[model samples]
Target chain A: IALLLLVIFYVFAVMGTKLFAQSFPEWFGTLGASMYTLFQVMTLESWSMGIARPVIEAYPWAWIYFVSFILVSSFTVLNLFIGIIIESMQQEQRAHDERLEMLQLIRDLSSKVD
Target chain B: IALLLLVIFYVFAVMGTKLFAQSFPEWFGTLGASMYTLFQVMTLESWSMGIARPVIEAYPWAWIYFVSFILVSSFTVLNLFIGIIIESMQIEQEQRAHDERLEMLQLIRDLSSKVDRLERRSG
Candidate 1:
């Protein structure tokens, strides 16, 4: 299936726990157990209170990775929405053309034969 | 100023804290701090986890309020985009042709009547 968000979020979850499991067990303990933790941050819940802030106490550079996850999530959602908008807006352009020919037909018909 | 969103969010935040302060001060204590909680819930970060689910466990009737805020915020955004769509692509089919097309029909009737009158006069 077309699972970019799933694949990407899952990839971050995998790396996040791998990168973060050394310290926090509640948030990033195991592979299957901690995806909800990523979901927590993905929503910007108490992500700092539980996951990012505490992890950064040990590793200040972790904020980069933390913000990087947000960039990907936001950018992915943005591009997909852009797909919807562009597809919708293009249909408006050609709708006006078909209606234009009626005027020409009427004009020629008005000047009829002897 | 035009502050529908502001007024609505502020009103709900005031009463939500009022309705909610008795049980959960951490999320809805006074007015200043819990706005972030409302913003968090507005974005639905853990609206169910932290606020709505537990609050409903106590009151059993607060999902209305939770969804009420979302109705205002989310529906406002939905209608706002609708305005953008309508305003942006506003060239509807013209009624001028519809108006003139009827006159053309009347003219054809008048022309046929002229032919009928001439043929009668010749006969």
Candidate 2:
């Protein structure tokens, strides 16, 4: 449910950025264009200095929403996303290796047992 | 042909960045995702500070291929892209100037030429 909202918001944001790239004020347009790319790197390690500090300094009122998003997005959404990708990659490599091993086993069995 | 290939590689790289962003190791995935934006600002000044030290320390075996890519992609691909955009903007300005020059030249040429021909006929 939350992920769905986040994804929808993300799509909307990207579309908005593309639409407003030439139309918006130069700084806002550049900031909008860069935000999606910056979000990709907004990890726990880098967030404080890279994102939080800047935002708080620029818009102190934003702290409420920013804190909420960080807790929801980073703590919950990120772990799930990372875990799913990592597991899928692991499964893919495992399947490929297993298939090769099975083929090798079949070759050995044909030579020895047959 | 090389420029074509370079653009092709760049497109492929960005596409690869998108796709591999899904499948790469945590480190590599993050690096690939960052590379596009990083390339946008890769200056001669920042290149030494941000990029060179890291690569030299980590992938010494890749120095040949890495250096080649940097020279081609950074020096050539990049300047070409920036230069292309800057030149395009300049060309538009020059085109407007050219049109105004032509209009002014036509008016002055007509008036002066007419006066000279009239003087020749009368004098």
Candidate 3:
């Protein structure tokens, strides 16, 4: 669900820039386009330009959407995804370790019986 | 071979800019610096500003080395690099799928043997 929304946000952001490029001035278009691109990489400029500049522009209403949706997905949700991946990896490692230990125990028991 | 040439284009591009920066005006220096930075990222500006701008300024046939080397490395050789990475990832996925199937087969066999032993004990 989160991943789906993240993908939607990504698509919307890209499409938004493409659609609005003509509406905005060249500098504004450049800023918007660059923000969208940099956001994907989680670069410092993304946060500064996307979040910081928008806030300073005094669109406080827009600010809420920017931070809650954009920042949440980019930073918080991204961390959540990383955590889930790392957790699954750790579980796989533990399962492998348990299997090795059980096999070693079985081998020892069979040698003793022989 | 392509990778080595790519790296050479990259390093030379970087060194060329760094060396030339001291000789140029601020705008020229900024242009040179940005060209190198964007080249690594494979950004369009890197090609436009790096190759296109230089050519239009009548760097006549400094264009050859730029297009032959930088353009070749960026456009052609980058695809080759991507192909290599994708191929390796495919091989790894195949190995993982094989291991998973083998484990499932072993699990089913183990379950069958356990059931047979239980039947013998009960009978």
Candidate 4:
């Protein structure tokens, strides 16, 4: 699923640059440039001042595009983090509980024998 | 702990900017500027191309400062996320376990009552 989202993001980058290439040549001249710029935006850096502001000046409603893109991408990344962390933590907790149960069983068996 | 780390990061940003002010005035001109720049760097944006490259050009070894700053800050933030998430999850797990134990106790009580009734009937 993560790989799928990555591919989707790359496609979005390609289309995004193609759509805004005329106005923002430096940042969106090609697919690679667009991907790099989008990655920077994903980091929530100075994307507004460094990139969006200029593009918004030319295309008055450009904020929607960038804003939506960030929201969607950030949401995906955040979910990925949560999913990975929770899955691993749950596994660890399960193993811990299993160990405790095993120790309890051994104690119970020894008590019965005695 | 999160607030403490934030404060520590802010102080580090201030000191870092002051340390690099001579070489990178635009990004580290003042406390606020340094904070903002560091925030951008923390986001892992174009820190290399947009900010660090020029600083590295003037002070060749300056990569150490920016790289270390990012590493430390990112680690703190990542740990913060993990800490919060794990703490909440553990709380949730404890509540679940409490509920399950209560149900198990109720089942044991029910079984014991049934056994008592059987013993009475047999006697």
Q: Is the docking of candidate 2 incorrect, acceptable, medium or high quality?
A: incorrect
Report the C-alpha lDDT of model 4 over A35-93, residue by residue, as the tens digit.
Answer: 66676677677788888888888886667778888888878877776766867685447
C-alpha lDDT of residue B106 in model 4: 61
Could you tell me the TM-score of candidate 2?
0.26
Compute the lDDT of residue A98 as modeled in candidate 3: 49
Give the best candidate by TM-score: 4
- Candidate 1 vs 4: which has more TM-score: 4
Per lDDT, the best of the predicted structures is: 4
The residue pairs found clashing in candidate 4 are none
Residue-level lDDT tens digits of model 2 in A1-91: 4566466446534643554455433312653333432232222334455444655665565465446545655565545544443444324
Off by over 4 Å in 1: A31-33, A90-114, B1-42, B45-123
Better of 1 and 4 by lDDT: 4
lDDT digits (tens) for residues A1-114 of candidate 1: 128888877888888778767777656777533565565566666677756778888888778778898888778766665545565653354434544654554455555434
lDDT of 1: 0.67
For residues B66-96, what per-residue lDDT tens digits would candidate 2 score against the true structure? 3344445544554454445445542346556
lDDT against true structure, model 4: 0.70
Sorted into a CAPRI-style docking class, model 3 comes out as incorrect
lDDT of 4 at A29: 80
